[PDB]
Coordinates of C-alpha atoms (C1' of nucleotides) and ligand atoms in Angstrom, one line a residue:
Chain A
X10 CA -20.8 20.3 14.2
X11 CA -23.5 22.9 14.3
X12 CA -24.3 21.2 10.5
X13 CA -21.9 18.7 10.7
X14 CA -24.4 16.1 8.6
X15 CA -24.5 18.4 5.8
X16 CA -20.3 19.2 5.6
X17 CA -20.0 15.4 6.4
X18 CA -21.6 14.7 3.2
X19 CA -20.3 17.1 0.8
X20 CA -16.4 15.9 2.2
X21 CA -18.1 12.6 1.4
X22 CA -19.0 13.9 -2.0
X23 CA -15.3 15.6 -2.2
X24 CA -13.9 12.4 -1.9
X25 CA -15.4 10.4 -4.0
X26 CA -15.2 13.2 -6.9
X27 CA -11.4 13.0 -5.8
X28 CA -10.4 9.1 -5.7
X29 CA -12.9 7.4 -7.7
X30 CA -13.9 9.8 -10.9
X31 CA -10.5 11.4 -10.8
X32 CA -12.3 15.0 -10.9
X33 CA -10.4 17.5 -9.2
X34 CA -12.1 20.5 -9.9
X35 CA -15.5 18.9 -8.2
X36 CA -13.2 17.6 -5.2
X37 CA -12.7 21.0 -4.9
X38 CA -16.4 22.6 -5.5
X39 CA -17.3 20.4 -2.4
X40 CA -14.5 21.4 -0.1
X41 CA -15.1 24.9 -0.7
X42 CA -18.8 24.2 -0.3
X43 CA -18.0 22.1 3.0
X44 CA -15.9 25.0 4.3
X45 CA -17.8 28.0 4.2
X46 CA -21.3 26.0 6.1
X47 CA -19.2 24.8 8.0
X48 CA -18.5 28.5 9.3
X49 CA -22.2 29.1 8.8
X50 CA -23.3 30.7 12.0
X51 CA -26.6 28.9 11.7
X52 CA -28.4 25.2 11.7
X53 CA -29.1 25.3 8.2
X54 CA -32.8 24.8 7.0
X55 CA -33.0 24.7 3.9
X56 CA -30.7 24.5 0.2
X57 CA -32.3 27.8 -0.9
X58 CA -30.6 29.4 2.8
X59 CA -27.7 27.6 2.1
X60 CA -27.3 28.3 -1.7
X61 CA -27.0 32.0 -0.2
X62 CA -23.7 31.0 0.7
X63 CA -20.6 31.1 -1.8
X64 CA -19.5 28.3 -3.3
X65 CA -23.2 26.5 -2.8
X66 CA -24.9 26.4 -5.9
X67 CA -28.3 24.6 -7.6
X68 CA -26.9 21.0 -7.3
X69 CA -25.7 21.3 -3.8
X70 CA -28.6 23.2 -2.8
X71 CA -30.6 20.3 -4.0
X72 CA -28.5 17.5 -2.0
X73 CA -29.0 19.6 1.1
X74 CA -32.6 19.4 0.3
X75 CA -32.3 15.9 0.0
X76 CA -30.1 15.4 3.5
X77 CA -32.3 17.5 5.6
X78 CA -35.5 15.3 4.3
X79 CA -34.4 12.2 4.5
X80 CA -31.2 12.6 6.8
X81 CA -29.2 11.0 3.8
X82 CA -28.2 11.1 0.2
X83 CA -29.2 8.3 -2.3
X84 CA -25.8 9.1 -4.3
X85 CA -23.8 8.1 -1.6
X86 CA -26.1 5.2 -0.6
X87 CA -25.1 3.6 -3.9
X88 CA -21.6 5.2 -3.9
X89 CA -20.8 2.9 -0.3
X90 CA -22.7 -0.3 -2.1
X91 CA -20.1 -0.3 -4.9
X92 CA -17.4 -2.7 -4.4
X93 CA -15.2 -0.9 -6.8
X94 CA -15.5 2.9 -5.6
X95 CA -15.4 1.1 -1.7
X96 CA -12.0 -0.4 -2.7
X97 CA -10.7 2.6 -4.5
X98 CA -11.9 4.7 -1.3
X99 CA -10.2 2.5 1.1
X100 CA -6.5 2.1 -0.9
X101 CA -6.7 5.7 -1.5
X102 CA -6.3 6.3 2.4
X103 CA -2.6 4.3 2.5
X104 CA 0.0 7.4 2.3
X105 CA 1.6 7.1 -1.2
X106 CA -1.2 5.3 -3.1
X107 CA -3.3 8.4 -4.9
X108 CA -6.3 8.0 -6.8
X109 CA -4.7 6.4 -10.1
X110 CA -2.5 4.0 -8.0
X111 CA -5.5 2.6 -6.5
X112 CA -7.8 2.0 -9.2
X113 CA -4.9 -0.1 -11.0
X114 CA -4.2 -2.1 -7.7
X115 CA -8.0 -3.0 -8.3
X116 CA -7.4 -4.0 -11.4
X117 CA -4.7 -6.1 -10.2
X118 CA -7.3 -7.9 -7.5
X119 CA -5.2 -6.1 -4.6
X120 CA -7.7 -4.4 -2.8
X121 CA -7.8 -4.8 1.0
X122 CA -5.5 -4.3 3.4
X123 CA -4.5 -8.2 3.4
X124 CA -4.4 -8.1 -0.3
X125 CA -1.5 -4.9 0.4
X126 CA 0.6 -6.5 3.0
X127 CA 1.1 -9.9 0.8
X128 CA 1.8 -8.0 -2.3
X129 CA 5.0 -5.2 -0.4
X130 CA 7.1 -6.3 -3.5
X131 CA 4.4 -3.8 -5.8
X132 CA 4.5 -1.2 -3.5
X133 CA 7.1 2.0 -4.3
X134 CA 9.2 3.1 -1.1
X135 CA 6.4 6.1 -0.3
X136 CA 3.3 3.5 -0.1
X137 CA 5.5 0.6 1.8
X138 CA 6.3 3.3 4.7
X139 CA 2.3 4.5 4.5
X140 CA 1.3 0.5 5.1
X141 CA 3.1 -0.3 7.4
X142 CA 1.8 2.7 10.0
X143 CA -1.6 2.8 7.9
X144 CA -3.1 2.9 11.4
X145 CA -0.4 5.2 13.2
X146 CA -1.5 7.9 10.4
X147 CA -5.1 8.4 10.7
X148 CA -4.9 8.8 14.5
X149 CA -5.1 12.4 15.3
X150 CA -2.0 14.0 17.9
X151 CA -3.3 16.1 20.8
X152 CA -1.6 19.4 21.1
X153 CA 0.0 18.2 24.5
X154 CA 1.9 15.5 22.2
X155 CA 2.4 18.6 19.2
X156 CA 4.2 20.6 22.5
X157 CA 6.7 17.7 23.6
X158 CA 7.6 17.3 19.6
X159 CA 8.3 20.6 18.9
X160 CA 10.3 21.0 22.1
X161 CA 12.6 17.9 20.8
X162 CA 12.0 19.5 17.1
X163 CA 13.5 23.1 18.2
X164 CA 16.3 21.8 20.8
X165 CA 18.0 19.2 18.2
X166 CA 18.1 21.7 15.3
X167 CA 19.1 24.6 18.0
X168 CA 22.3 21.9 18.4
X169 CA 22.6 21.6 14.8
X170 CA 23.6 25.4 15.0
X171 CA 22.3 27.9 17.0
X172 CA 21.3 30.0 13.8
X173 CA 18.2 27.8 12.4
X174 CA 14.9 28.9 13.0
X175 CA 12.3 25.9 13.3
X176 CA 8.6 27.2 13.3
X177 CA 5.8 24.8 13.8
X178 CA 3.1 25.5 11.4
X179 CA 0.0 23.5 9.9
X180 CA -2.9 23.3 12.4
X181 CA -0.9 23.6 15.1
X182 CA 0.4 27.3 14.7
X183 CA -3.7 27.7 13.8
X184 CA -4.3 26.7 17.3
X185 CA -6.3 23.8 17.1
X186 CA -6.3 21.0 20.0
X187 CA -5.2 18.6 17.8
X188 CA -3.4 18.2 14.9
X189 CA -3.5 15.6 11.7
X190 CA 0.4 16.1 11.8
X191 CA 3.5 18.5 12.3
X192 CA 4.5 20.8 9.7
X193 CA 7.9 22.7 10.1
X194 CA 9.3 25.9 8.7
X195 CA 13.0 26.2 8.8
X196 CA 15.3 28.9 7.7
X197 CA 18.9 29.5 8.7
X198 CA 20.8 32.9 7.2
X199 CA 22.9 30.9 4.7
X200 CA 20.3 30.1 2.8
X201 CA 18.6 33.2 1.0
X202 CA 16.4 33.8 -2.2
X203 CA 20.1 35.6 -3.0
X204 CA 22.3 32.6 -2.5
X205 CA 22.5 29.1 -0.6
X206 CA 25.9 29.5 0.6
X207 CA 25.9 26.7 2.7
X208 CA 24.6 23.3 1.2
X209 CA 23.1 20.3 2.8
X210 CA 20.9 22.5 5.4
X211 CA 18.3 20.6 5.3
X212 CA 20.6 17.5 5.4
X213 CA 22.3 18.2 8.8
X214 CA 18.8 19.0 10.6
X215 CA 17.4 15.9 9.2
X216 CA 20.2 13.8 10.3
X217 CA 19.8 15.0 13.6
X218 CA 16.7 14.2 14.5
X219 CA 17.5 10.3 12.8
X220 CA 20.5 10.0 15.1
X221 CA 18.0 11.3 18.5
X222 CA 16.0 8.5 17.0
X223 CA 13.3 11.4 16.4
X224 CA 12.7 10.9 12.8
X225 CA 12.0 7.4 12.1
X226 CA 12.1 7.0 8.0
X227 CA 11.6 9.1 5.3
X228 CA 9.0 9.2 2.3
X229 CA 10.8 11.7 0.6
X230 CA 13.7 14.2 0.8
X231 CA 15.1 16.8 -1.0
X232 CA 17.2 19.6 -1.1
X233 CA 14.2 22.3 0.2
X234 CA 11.2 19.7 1.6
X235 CA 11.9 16.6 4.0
X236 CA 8.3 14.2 4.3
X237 CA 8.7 11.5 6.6
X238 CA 8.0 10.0 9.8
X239 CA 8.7 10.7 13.8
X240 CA 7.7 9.0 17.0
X241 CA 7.7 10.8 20.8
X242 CA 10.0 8.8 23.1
X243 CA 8.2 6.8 25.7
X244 CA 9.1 5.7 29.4
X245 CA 10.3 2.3 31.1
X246 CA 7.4 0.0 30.7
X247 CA 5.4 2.5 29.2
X248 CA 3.6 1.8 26.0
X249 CA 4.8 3.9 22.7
X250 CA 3.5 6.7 21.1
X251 CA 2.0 6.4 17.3
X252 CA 4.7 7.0 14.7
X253 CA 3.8 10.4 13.3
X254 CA 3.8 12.4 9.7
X255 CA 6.2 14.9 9.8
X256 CA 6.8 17.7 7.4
X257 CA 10.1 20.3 7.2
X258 CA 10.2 22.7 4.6
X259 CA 13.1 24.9 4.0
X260 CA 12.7 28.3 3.1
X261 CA 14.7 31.7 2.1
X262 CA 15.3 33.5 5.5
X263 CA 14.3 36.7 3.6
X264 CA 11.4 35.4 2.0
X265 CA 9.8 34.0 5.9
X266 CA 6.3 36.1 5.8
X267 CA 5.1 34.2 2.2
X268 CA 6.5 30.9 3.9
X269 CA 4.9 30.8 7.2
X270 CA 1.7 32.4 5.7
X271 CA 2.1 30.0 3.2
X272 CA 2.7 26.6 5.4
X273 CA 0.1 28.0 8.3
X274 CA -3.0 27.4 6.0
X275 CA -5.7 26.1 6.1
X276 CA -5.0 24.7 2.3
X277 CA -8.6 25.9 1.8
X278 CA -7.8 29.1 3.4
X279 CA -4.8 29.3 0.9
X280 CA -6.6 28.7 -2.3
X281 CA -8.8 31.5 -1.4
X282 CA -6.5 34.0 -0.3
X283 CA -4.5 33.4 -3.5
X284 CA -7.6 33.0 -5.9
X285 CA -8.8 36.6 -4.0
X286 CA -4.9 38.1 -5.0
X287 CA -5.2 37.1 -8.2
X288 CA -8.5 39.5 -8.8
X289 CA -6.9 42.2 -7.1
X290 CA -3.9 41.6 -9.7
X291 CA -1.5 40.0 -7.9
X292 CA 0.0 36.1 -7.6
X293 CA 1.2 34.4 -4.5
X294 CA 3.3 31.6 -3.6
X295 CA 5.6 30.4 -0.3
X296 CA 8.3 33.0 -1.4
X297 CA 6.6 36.3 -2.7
X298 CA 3.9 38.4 -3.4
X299 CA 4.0 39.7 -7.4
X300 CA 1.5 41.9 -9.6
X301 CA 0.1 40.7 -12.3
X302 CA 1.7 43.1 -15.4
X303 CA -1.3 43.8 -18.1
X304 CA 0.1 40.9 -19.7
X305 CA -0.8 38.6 -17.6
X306 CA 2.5 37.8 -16.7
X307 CA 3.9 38.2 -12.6
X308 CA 6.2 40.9 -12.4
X309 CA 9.0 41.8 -9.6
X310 CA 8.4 40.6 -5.7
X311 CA 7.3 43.5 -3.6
X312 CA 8.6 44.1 -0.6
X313 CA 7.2 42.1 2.6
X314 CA 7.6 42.6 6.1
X315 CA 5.2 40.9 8.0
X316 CA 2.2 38.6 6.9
X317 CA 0.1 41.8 7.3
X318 CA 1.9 43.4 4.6
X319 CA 0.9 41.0 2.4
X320 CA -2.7 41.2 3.4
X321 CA -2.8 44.5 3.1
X322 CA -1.3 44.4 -0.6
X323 CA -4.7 42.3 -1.4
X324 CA -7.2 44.8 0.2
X325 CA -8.0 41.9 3.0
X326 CA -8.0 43.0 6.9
X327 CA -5.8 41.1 9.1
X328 CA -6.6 37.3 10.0
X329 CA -4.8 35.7 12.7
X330 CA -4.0 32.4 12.2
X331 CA -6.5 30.7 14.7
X332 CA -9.2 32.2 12.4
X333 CA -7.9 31.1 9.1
X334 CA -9.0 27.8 9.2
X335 CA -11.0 26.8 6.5
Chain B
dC1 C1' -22.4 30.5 -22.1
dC2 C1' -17.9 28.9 -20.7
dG3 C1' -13.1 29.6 -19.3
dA4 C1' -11.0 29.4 -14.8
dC5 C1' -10.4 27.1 -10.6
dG6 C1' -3.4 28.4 -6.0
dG7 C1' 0.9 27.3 -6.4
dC8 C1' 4.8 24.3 -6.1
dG9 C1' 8.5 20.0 -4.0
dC10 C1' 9.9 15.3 -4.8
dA11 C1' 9.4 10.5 -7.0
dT12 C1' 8.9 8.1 -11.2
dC13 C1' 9.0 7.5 -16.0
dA14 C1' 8.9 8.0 -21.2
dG15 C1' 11.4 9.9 -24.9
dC16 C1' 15.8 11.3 -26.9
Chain C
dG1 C1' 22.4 11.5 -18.6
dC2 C1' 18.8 15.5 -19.3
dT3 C1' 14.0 17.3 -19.7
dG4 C1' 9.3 17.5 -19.5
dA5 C1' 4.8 15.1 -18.1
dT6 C1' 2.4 12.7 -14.7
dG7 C1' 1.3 11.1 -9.8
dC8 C1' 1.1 12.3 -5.2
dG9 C1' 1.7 15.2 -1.8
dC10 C1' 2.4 19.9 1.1
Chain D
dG1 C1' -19.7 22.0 -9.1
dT2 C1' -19.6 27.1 -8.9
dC3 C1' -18.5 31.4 -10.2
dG4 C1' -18.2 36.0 -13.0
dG5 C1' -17.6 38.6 -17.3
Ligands
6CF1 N1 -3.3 21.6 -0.7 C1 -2.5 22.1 0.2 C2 -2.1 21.4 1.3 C3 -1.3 22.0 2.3 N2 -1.0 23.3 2.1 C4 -0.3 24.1 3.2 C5 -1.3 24.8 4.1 C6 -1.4 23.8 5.3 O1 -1.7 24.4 6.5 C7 0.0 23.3 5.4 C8 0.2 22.0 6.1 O2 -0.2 20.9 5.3 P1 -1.0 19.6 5.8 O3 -1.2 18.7 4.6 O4 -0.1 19.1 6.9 C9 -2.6 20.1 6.5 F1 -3.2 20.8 5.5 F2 -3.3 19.0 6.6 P2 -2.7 21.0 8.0 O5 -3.4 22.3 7.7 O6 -1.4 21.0 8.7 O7 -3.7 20.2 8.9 P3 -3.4 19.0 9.6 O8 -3.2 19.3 11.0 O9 -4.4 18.0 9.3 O10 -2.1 18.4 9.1 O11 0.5 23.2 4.0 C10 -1.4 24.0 1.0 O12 -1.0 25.2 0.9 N3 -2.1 23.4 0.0
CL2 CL1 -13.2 18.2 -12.3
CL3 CL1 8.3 37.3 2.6
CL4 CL1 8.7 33.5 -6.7
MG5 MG1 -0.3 19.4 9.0
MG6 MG1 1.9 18.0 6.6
NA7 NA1 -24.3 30.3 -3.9
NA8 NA1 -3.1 8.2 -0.2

DNA sequence: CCGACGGCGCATCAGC
DNA sequence: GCTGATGCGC
DNA sequence: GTCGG
C-alpha cells in the first residue's frame, strides 16, 4: 500500500494488455513492474526514481509521471469508458472464460452476467461451474478458514492411506493472512519419477474428499493435477461457508523440493527465479533442476535435497517462503 | 537493434 | 482413434 | 513493455 495507486494501475494496465489486446508479454512487463514497486521501500516520487527500478522502463516511467500529477491515467480513463474492453474485462473474471472466450461471447451479444446465466447451454463444463460461484471465487479465505481446510484436507487423505503426504502450498505456505485459494502438494511412495506402481492415486484422494462432501465439483481432473471446488462444513442454523477453488497436484515423492518450490510461488517469484537459472545455465521446472549443455539443450537432473540446494545451484542465497512473494 | 520473455497439466478441436 | 495446436489455467 | 548482448 505504501504506493498502492501506482501498482494498482500498472495490474490495471496488466490486465487490460492481458484480456482485451491479447498481449501476453505486456501483461507480463506490467506485473513485473507492479511487483518489484511494490517492494519498493519508499513512497515513490517520481518515474525517473522509479525507472531505477528493474523492470520499469521509459513508458512506465512516464505513466507514473502522469499518476502522481494527476492521481490518474488518461489510458485507463478511456479503457473503463469502452463498452467493449468493459465487457471483455468483466467475462474474463468467470473461471473458465479466458481472454479469447470472452471477446467472442461479445460478439455473440452475451456480455453481462444476465446475458451468461440465460445462455448455460454455450458455456463448456469449466465456465458453467465458474458462473455459478462467480461470487463465491473472488471472495478472499482468511487463514483461520485455510487452517480448518487443510485440517479436513490432511485427515481424509491420512484415511485414504497413511502413506500420502498432503502439503498446503500457494499463499498460504507463503504465510499470508489470507489466501485467493488452496493449493495442494501430494506425493505418496508409489508414485516416483522411476515408476507409478500404483494407479489412480490421485483418484482415491479425490474421491474421498467427494464422499466427506469436501470437494464439491470438479473443473478438471487428471491423472497428476485435480482443479475444482470445496466448501468448509458449517453448524445447525449456521450460515455456509463460500464454495472455494481448490487445487491438488500430484508429484514424484523423489522429485518433492522442485515441486513444493515450484507450487509455493509467488508465480512472479517463479518466473524470476527460473528466468535468473536460465542465465546461470540451468532450466527448472516442478520436477528438476538441469544445465543447460552448450547446445542449448537441458541435460541430466542434478541431484536435490532440499529447496536450498536448488538455490544454491543458481548462485541465489536462501529465501524463505514468507519472503518470496512477488 | 531486436530476440527473448518459465514451464507445464488438462480440455477441446482440427486434421488424418 | 492418435497427435499436435490452441485456450485456459496452475 | 523491458531487458541485455
Ligand atoms: N502462472 C503461474 C501460476 C501459478 N504458479 C504456481 C506458483 C503459485 O504459488 C502456485 C499456486 O497458484 P495460484 O494460481 O493458486 C496463485 F498463484 F494465485 P497463489 O500464489 O496460490 O496465490 P493465491 O492465494 O491467490 O491463490 O502455482 C506458477 O508457477 N505460475
Ligand atoms: Cl505481447
Ligand atoms: Cl527435487
Ligand atoms: Cl524434467
Ligand atoms: Mg493459490
Ligand atoms: Mg490455485
Ligand atoms: Na528500469
Ligand atoms: Na477467467
Amino acid at each position: 500500500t505504501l504506493n498502492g495507486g501506482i501498482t494498482d494501475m500498472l495490474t490495471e494496465l496488466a490486465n487490460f494488455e492481458k484480456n482485451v489486446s491479447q498481449a501476453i508479454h505486456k501483461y507480463n512487463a506490467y506485473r513485473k513492474a507492479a511487483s518489484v514497486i511494490a517492494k519498493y521501500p519508499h513512497k515513490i516520487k517520481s518515474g525517473a526514481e522509479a525507472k531505477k527500478l528493474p523492470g520499469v522502463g521509459t513508458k512506465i516511467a512516464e505513466k507514473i509521471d502522469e499518476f502522481l500529477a494527476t492521481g490518474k491515467l488518461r489510458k485507463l480513463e478511456k479503457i473503463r469508458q469502452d463498452d467493449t474492453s468493459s465487457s471483455i474485462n468483466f467475462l474474463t473474471r468467470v473461471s473458465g472464460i479466458g481472454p479469447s472466450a470472452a471477446r467472442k461471447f461479445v460478439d455473440e451479444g452475451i456480455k453481462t452476467l444476465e446475458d451468461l446465466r440465460k445462455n448455460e447451454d454455450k458455456l463448456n463444463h469449466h465456465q458453467r461451474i465458474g458462473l455459478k460461484y462467480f461470487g463465491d471465487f473472488e471472495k478472499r479465505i482468511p487463514r483461520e478458514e485455510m487452517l480448518q481446510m487443510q485440517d479436513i484436507v490432511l485427515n481424509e487423505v491420512k484415511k485414504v492411506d497413511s502413506e500420502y503426504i498432503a502439503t498446503v502450498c500457494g499463499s498460504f505456505r507463503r504465510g499470508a493472512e489470507s489466501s485467493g485459494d488452496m493449493d495442494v502438494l501430494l506425493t505418496h511412495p508409489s508414485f516416483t519419477s522411476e515408476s507409478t506402481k500404483q494407479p489412480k492415486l490421485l483418484h482415491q484422494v479425490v474421491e474421498q474428499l467427494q464422499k466427506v462432501h469436501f470437494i464439491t465439483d470438479t473443473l478438471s481432473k487428471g491423472e497428476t493435477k485435480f482443479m475444482g471446488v470445496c466448501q468448509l462444513p458449517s453448524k445447525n442454523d449456521e450460515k455456509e461457508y463460500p464454495h472455494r477453488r481448490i487445487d491438488i497436484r500430484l508429484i514424484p515423492k523423489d522429485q518433492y523440493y522442485c515441486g513444493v518450490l515450484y507450487f509455493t510461488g509467488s508465480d512472479i517469484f517463479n518466473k524470476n527465479m527460473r528466468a535468473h537459472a536460465l542465465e546461470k545455465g540451468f532450466t527448472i521446472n516442478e520436477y528438476t533442476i538441469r544445465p543447460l549443455g552448450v547446445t542449448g539443450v537441458a541435460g541430466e537432473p542434478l541431484p536435490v535435497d532440499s529447496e536450498k540446494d536448488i538455490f544454491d545451484y543458481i548462485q541465489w542465497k536462501y529465501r524463505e517462503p514468507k519472503d518470496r512473494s512477488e
